[PDB]
Ligand binder design. Structure first.
Ligand SMILES: [Ca+2]
Ligand SMILES: [Mg+2]
Lengths: 152, 142, 68
């Protein structure tokens, strides 16, 4: 299954993260998720735990060859679609016009699911350049599209 | 792995200035001459000992052999300042002391306890701020 | 039923947060690569300095470098 071009990429990224926790030919299991994120997949935390991901730094370290099978195990994780996302946000939409309040937006992002931190919420809202109007409302469709299309 | 051309050109320039003879060799007279132009001039035994570090007569090729490994992966003041600048987003020109300590000791090619100690013994640090611009001047100078 | 509906909503949100986590990390990648070079430059040069700072040849060399 795994393309040789893909295995190359994983090595590039594995090496970077190896460097960042102290270059030894090993990546902390705590960073499995982020390595995979850098490779362009979007695993849930539960997904990465399932593959041996840990809950804090310094419990376990993986050499590349224990890492490859994790990345392969994560490549088939369910990834959300635009339609799932619209359906999700529409359950919070009080009048079905496509607006949600910024406070509500923060509630779903930081109060539900795999809760994000305030910093991460602040950051995504900043990076996506999402504005509220004078009544503090946002168009979630814009936000969803921007998050999906990514930083570049 | 190296060494870059600019470094070669520098070394040649250095060698050229120390060889007051234009002889193509550095000897003890060249050395005394150069040191005396810069300040204190070390005693003849220090000088002879410096010359002894070279297997033979101090040609430029011998000069190279004496410096190449030790200068191998060194970078300009500028390059190093920009290296530091990459951890200084707001361009304060300082780094939180704890931050540079963490980077140096726990990441990359980790510094051991002795490297850390000698690194910071004389480092410019004040109010928890590590002055990397000043630090870079220091590691290039004296 | 209603348990299933609540569970799928929660999973969908989690996937979106997953999309956000991804975005964030990817956005940071280039800087992470640059910082790696940066820190390599720093560690390597500090290490070179520790070796050659008491070496008489280097002390000479560094006094000559500015005059070039
Ligand atoms: Ca490592
Ligand atoms: Mg001469």
């Amino acid at each position: 299954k795994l393309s040789q071009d893909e295995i190359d990429d994983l090595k590039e990224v594995f090496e970077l993260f190896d460097f960042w926790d102290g270059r030894d030919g090993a990546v902390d299991a705590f960073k499995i998720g982020d390595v995979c994120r850098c490779l362009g997949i979007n695993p849930r935390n539960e997904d990465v735990f399932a593959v041996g991901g840990t809950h804090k730094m310094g419990e376990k370290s993986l050499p590349f060859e224990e890492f490859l099978p994790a990345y392969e195990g994560l490549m088939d994780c369910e990834q959300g679609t635009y339609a799932d996302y619209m359906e999700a946000f529409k359950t919070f939409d009080r009048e079905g016009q496509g607006f949600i309040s910024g406070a509500e937006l923060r509630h779903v992002l930081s109060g539900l699911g795999e809760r994000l931190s305030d910093e991460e919420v602040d950051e995504i809202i900043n990076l996506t350049d999402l504005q509220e109007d004078l009544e503090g409302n946002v168009k979630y469709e814009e936000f969803v599209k921007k998050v999906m299309t990514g930083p570049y | 792995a190296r060494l870059p051309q600019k470094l070669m050109q520098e070394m040649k320039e250095a060698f050229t200035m120390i060889d007051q003879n234009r002889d193509g060799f550095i000897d003890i007279n060249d050395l005394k001459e150069m040191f005396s132009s810069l300040g204190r001039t070390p005693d003849d035994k220090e000088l002879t000992a410096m010359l002894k570090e070279a297997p033979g007569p101090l040609n430029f090729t011998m000069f190279l052999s004496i410096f190449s490994d030790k200068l191998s992966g060194t970078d300009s003041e500028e390059t190093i300042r920009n290296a530091f600048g990459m951890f200084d987003e707001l361009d304060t020109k300082k780094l939180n002391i704890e931050y540079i300590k963490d980077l140096l000791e726990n990441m990359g090619d980790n510094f051991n306890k002795d490297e850390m100690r000698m690194t910071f013994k004389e480092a410019p640090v004040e109010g928890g701020k590590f002055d990397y611009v000043r630090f870079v001047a220091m590691i290039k100078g004296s | 039923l209603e348990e299933m509906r609540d569970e799928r909503l929660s999973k969908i949100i989690s996937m979106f947060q997953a999309h956000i986590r991804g975005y964030l990390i990817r956005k940071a990648y280039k800087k992470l690569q640059d910082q790696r070079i940066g820190l390599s430059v720093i560690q390597r040069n500090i290490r070179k300095w520790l070796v050659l700072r008491n070496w008489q040849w280097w002390k000479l060399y560094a006094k000559v470098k500015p005059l070039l």
